[PDB]
Amino acid sequence: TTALVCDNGSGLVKAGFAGDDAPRAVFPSIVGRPRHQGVMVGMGQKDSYVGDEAQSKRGILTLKYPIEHGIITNWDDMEKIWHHTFYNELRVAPEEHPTLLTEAPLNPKANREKMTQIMFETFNVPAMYVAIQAVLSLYASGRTTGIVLDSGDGVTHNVPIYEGYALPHAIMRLDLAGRDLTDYLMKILTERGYSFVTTAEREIVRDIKEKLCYVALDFENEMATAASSSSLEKSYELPDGQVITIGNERFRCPETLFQPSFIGMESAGIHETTYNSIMKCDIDIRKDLYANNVMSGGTTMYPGIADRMQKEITALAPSTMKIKIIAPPERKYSVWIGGSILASLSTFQQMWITKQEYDEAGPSIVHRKCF
Amino acid sequence: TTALVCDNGSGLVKAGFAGDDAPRAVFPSIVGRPRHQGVMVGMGQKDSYVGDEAQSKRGILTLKYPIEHGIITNWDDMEKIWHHTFYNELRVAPEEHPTLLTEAPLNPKANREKMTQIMFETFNVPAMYVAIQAVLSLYASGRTTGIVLDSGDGVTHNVPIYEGYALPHAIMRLDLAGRDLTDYLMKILTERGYSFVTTAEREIVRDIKEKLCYVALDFENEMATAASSSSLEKSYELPDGQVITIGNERFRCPETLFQPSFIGMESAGIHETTYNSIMKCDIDIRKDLYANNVMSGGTTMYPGIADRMQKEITALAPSTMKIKIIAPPERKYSVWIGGSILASLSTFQQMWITKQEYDEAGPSIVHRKCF
Amino acid sequence: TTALVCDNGSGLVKAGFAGDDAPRAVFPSIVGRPRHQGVMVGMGQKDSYVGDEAQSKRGILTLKYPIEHGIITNWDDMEKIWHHTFYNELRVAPEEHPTLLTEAPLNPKANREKMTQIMFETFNVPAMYVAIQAVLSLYASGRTTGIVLDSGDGVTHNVPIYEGYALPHAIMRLDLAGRDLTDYLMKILTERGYSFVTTAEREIVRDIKEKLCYVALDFENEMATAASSSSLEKSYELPDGQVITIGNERFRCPETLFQPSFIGMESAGIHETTYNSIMKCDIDIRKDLYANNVMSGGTTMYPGIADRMQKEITALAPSTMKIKIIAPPERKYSVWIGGSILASLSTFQQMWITKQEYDEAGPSIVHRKCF
Amino acid sequence: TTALVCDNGSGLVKAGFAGDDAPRAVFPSIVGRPRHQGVMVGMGQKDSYVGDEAQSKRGILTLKYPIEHGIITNWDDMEKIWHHTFYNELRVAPEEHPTLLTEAPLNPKANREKMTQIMFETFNVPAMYVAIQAVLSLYASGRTTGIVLDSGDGVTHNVPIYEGYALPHAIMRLDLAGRDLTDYLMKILTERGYSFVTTAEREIVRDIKEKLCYVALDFENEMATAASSSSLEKSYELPDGQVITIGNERFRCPETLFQPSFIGMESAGIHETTYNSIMKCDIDIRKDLYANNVMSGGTTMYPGIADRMQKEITALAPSTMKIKIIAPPERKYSVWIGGSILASLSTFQQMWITKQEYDEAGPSIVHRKCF
Amino acid sequence: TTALVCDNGSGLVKAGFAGDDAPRAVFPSIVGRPRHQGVMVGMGQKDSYVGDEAQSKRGILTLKYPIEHGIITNWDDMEKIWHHTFYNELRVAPEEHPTLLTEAPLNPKANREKMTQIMFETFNVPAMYVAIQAVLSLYASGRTTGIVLDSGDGVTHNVPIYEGYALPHAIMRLDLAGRDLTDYLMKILTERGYSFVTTAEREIVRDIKEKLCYVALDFENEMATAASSSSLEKSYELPDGQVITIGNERFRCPETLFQPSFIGMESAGIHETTYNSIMKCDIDIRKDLYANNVMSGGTTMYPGIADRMQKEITALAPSTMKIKIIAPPERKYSVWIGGSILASLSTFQQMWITKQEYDEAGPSIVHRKCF
């Protein structure tokens, strides 16, 4: 029975079974192919590496991410990852369980529809349902009210929910996200001669970022103190033993989330995106949202980012509004956790879209709405 | 002598001279600033683009509209546009002529007062008068009786006038207008992967809308026929040569005017706003208003919108009431045209507020009433 | 008065005076040292050969290029070349003139800073300014808009500029360049027994390349026709009189620019690097960039390379976009020419960084931005 | 059935049958001709001695090596040696078996093609395949990852292989090898009056080298200790009974591999050639290569050479990188052993190029790639 | 002051003073001892004849040459000749002057060291320096670039020098030289009954050779014409009045230099030795060497030898290479002349090895290198 929860994000694939409080399979949504050599099978050499093994043999592969900015672009590779997810990672035969999928709001309708088709035809998934990540994030936090600030790898978005009701009219979405932060950092590391150009190296820079980068509480001030050599500098050991010294970049990188323009992004920073979404909501609600900002996973894992936003939102908001940011430990899996909850949830059972229904109605059925 | 007619709307600035039957200067109320680069003058690089040149170099500018929802918010940029209007567009020295301004009803009093101050101090305008757009619209149509339905970019409003008398007690005003329609359309275009996020792209979407969108006579029915691929689909070529295919959005966008809730707007659709305004009028007048609905400019330019409202008002009204909607060609400049007429009108001459009077009485003088 | 223009590239040093339309001193950035013998001075034997004399006596020297991939690595030898440039080549006493330097974008900050220090301390250069090569290239072409495709010896890079504004957010940079092409060719010449291993021989292969190699319009097709002995074969006389016959290599070498993977380079070919840089620009600009691609110097000197890219970009671009590649004669000195123009340019005068300023502010001053 | 493994090197010919763990025929690739006398057959005097008999009667022959620097130069004599190999040494009729040949990387294409022609036409070899020596060396060591350092008689080369994939982009090749070491030693022996000038004597010096020479762990230091008469001196008995005393030369000879310049070679020593090849590989691989350097045969047989390189590579590498050099006993036949393995390998069977295929496609067929 | 120049060759001793353009003492390096008689002093009969007096009384002496193949073998007699050189020939007291010695390249180190010891201990030579003959030969010719072809009595050798730099890596050395030519000729004269077996007679044959022998431009052709009695025959009068007729031998003798094998020499002829030495040099140099071959003394005095080599080198070389052989009159003293120049040369002064230095450092000091 149970159910599968598959948070097929743009960065990491988080899969597991309903009822568990943690993902069982967490691995990079990556399909790698022998960068060079051509590679005739000959003996038995495969030309396809997925997830952890692509990381292991990263040095000979060109790594691709099927999903870009929250949208599945390379469907062949996407299908491949799902295949791998079920059989090689979870070790489960798809048709045993109904599957709960997730996605970012404001995606192309074809994203849902094509994904749906595959679930029902390639994997023969008894029944399937695609939920919105923001909703799930609140379930994880145990809230019915708040601003969900999702921000990881491909997509950043804001969803206002009030006492169980979604306020779709104020959804915000940015391309700013972890992947942009990574690439920005690559560009910045170059300032010190640390040239990174390969997809392998990009991947390394992701690892650098996740170890050293953090959010400043006052970018300008801290940046100024960085003029003096100090604790702001911290080293990193590369795979080949070469040691890197990181300085300003350690906080300049994540700062992009607050100052978009760093990468040529025209939009406003996440604190204003959040604030404005609240401004687009009814005045009787605004207060409740101010005291219940809920950070999801991904890039919200930077140290001190909660405090930084608390500061800036407080500045933007009215002085009597209590600004409080919810940013629990394990929020990196917030969506997946919510999925587990929802899937195990009793009444939710009626929401499954059976293959039967799909065959009867066709693709359009996935756009039905209900909690 | 003559006079200047300056229909300083929220979307387009329409300026010209009294007596002409068409605006001489029609350009976007836009102030653009180099999105990125910082831009030290250095050689002679300016950091300020207004109107047509902001459109021309749109790709490197962050475009701002000084006016929002009919209210001047960025006064610095507003002043700048007026400067540009007089010297760069009309090529006229302000102090030569008295100036006729316009605005939406129910604006903040400070809007009038601050605007007034600028006219008299920055531009030294001999004498100035601020009229209400609805009144002017009827002058353009040659009517003394009717419901003026103004609806363009920032403001939609209803004003009942009967045989030369204004009925201020039944004025309606909505935030629904062209700019909301544009942004809704952006949100909807996303359904097909047509991501538009920049102010430049917003501007493009405005152009899309103005070419392809039209009003359905029966939204539900037409929307249903759109299930079959047909003539409802129509393509559009983007600035970079990429081709867009528009389907449902082609009529779903303008439909928002009839179903507000599409963008989270709580108010009733324009056909009910109109109807209700008539209901708030004396029963002896109602009949005359029913047969004389006058559409102003802006969004009333959508194809078939007159017929659509005729239908719905007919449904709302009594069966014996002849419902007739006046929606002349060139109504996109209705207000401006009326301004030209009124300014050239003999007796109107007494209405000018001289700088002398202003200096004697102060700001409050602009709230005097007379036809 | 005047000014010195010193395009200190990785391959050739191009120096001259502002106002001239051609470099006065063009010579190889090479420092050679007696390969063997040890060489005690004894009588008066020097152990240091720079530029043309290193070429002349190439046969007994190990030739080094101080600059690698656009970065100054051997600062001692770099200083030496500059010394030579001023006194032995230009025959000018540095302190007479302000100096305009150039470099590739995305270099290590220390490259600028150390270079700066030397100018002010070793050569006592009154005032100095370091410009970006791409900007200069457009000046040479007389354009304010276009994609600069720089590609010579150490660095290939793409810079988008629009109507005087730089779009730094879409700068691309590759290690692929002339030096890699040379070394690839060495590796390929080996196929016919033409073993080249010395730095002297590398230098010869550079000369081979510059005489015989050209860009195919259809690599696959031409390569196929090369199966038949024909005009594709062309001979070359080595310094010792031995005659070489070149076949496939004549176009396989430069083809690497379009197919990176030939040398194990992971990145995309220059036509996609260019295209993608344009894709990273605002959609309102893209069109203007498509019709204004500007090839700089270096490797763009291969025959037919303009036509080849025109073809491939046309394939990549939308069918309505007019693809036009600007690739003027004398583009091999494009940057230097632009430097001459800019240095002579009136308003530019304010940009000089005086030694005074440097002493007051310190190294960081060279990162100030302005046109 | 089985297969023939013929490691036709430049020094020794190693031939045997697939499945054996050792060569059956190991003899010098030498063709000797009566140095003087002219030699009319008369009675039955032959003018051609091959291999062991050329060594036996070395004193009256001018000895030639058909192969020079890995390239077959004297094809007539090459054919002769192969004839001898099959009939006089192995005692096998060629057409019984498919033949596995080997060669150094980066050879002239004509080397493969002409060799191929002979196999199919002179010897009528059912099917034949030419493999690269480096690959075979790893098979012998049982590894799928490592740096193959091949260095014997005519060719020294470096090939990086990672988990079954070849990284051709970082292949290095030097002319430095055993034959150069021999000739250098001849030149050096002259210092003590030991004049060796004949090809016979060269051959003797080869034997001297193989008995006495070894690699210093610290050349400078050891060389200094050699100032004192000691155990560094060791004697050798010549064929005529004359006794030689060897001193410094005992380690100065092999030192050339680390200091090229000793013989006027411009290239870097083998420890830097190795290191640099690793530097040309992806950073995620480098570590694995550092701990898996695999020495092939030939000159790697010098005593302590593994330890010497371990030292110098350790100096070059990062301190955290575990440097380990694999240099097994019997590595002098590494390639041949690998050949035996590969030939017996099941799936490899498909790789044979049948004479049929050759006749159909022609010479070019030998450049097909597959494992 | 001045200096002594002592070209202590294997055939003739050429001694004189620095600054002179010709040797003052030129005499045979011969020590003769009463062949028979025993010779007790008795009255005052000496048992030791050196140089000219050994020639005068040649008929009763067994003549020995202390030097063989460029190596001093009989040190007792060597010392004796030097004694004679200084006191009996030059008439100078050694200690008055510093002494410049010469030797062939690739000699045993003990040759230099023992010679050195004697200079400092037996003759108390203030300071001494041992130069290489090839270098000196170029000084005589006034060149800094060329192939020195030295070939006289004991040693033939090739040294490449380029613009003041020695290229030791391509030095060639043969035992073929005048003494071998003499002995070959003795063996050949026997064909006509002219038996020569004594050292006295050997000496006569040397004189025959120097009068009649010459180099053929086409050995085969000329040899064929010698079938007819002609001008090729030429007579010689022996010391006892007996007349010799020389025919084929007149050119067969010197031909050995081009065809080594005539005396059982395995090496290649001097034209190939020269050519190959050039081939071992860098390709950028080869051309300069081709046009600057410099013949030293000794056997290069044969008539037409320059033309003969020009022919054969031209055949070996590329058709575009201008082959030019420098073979000036008085080249028989080339080395000595160069010595005079160098010794008088200003800067050279620093090169003298003082006895002081020798006593401090010991023998090894003579292997220091510098020009």
Ligand SMILES: Nc1ncnc2c1ncn2[C@@H]1O[C@H](COP(=O)(O)OP(=O)(O)O)[C@@H](O)[C@H]1O
């Ligand atoms: N400790 C960390 N600090 C900062 N960012 C992190 C950290 N861990 C992960 N990330 C970022 O989050 C991204 C993926 O997180 P996730 O929320 O699972 O993305 P998605 O749901 O879009 O797949 C990573 O690619 C990385 O950029």
Ligand SMILES: Nc1ncnc2c1ncn2[C@@H]1O[C@H](COP(=O)(O)OP(=O)(O)O)[C@@H](O)[C@H]1O
């Ligand atoms: N052909 C058209 N169809 C539909 N809408 C239009 C058309 N032309 C203009 N508009 C809308 O009208 C807006 C401005 O019209 P206008 O009445 O001048 O506005 P305002 O008076 O508020 O400045 C435009 O921004 C656009 O949204």
Ligand SMILES: Nc1ncnc2c1ncn2[C@@H]1O[C@H](COP(=O)(O)OP(=O)(O)O)[C@@H](O)[C@H]1O
């Ligand atoms: N005729 C030519 N054809 C092709 N490539 C050329 C030609 N001339 C020069 N080059 C290449 O351009 C390189 C240097 O050009 P340049 O643009 O001055 O380099 P840089 O500015 O990096 O110093 C040369 O090293 C050579 O590789």
Ligand SMILES: Nc1ncnc2c1ncn2[C@@H]1O[C@H](COP(=O)(O)OP(=O)(O)O)[C@@H](O)[C@H]1O
């Ligand atoms: N014990 C030894 N020590 C050092 N070098 C050796 C030894 N044995 C052989 N060699 C060198 O290896 C050379 C040939 O080895 P091999 O690897 O078979 O050469 P190739 O494969 O090129 O024919 C010999 O000519 C000799 O120079």
Ligand SMILES: Nc1ncnc2c1ncn2[C@@H]1O[C@H](COP(=O)(O)OP(=O)(O)O)[C@@H](O)[C@H]1O
């Ligand atoms: N005219 C000549 N023709 C040919 N060979 C000569 C002539 N004169 C001298 N030689 C040869 O040169 C030899 C010595 O010349 P030289 O160059 O001084 O020898 P070395 O320098 O070795 O002492 C003589 O022994 C003789 O063999």
Ligand SMILES: [Mg+2]
């Ligand atoms: Mg996510």
Ligand SMILES: [Mg+2]
């Ligand atoms: Mg209006």
Ligand SMILES: [Mg+2]
């Ligand atoms: Mg350049």
Ligand SMILES: [Mg+2]
């Ligand atoms: Mg081998």
Ligand SMILES: [Mg+2]
């Ligand atoms: Mg001599």
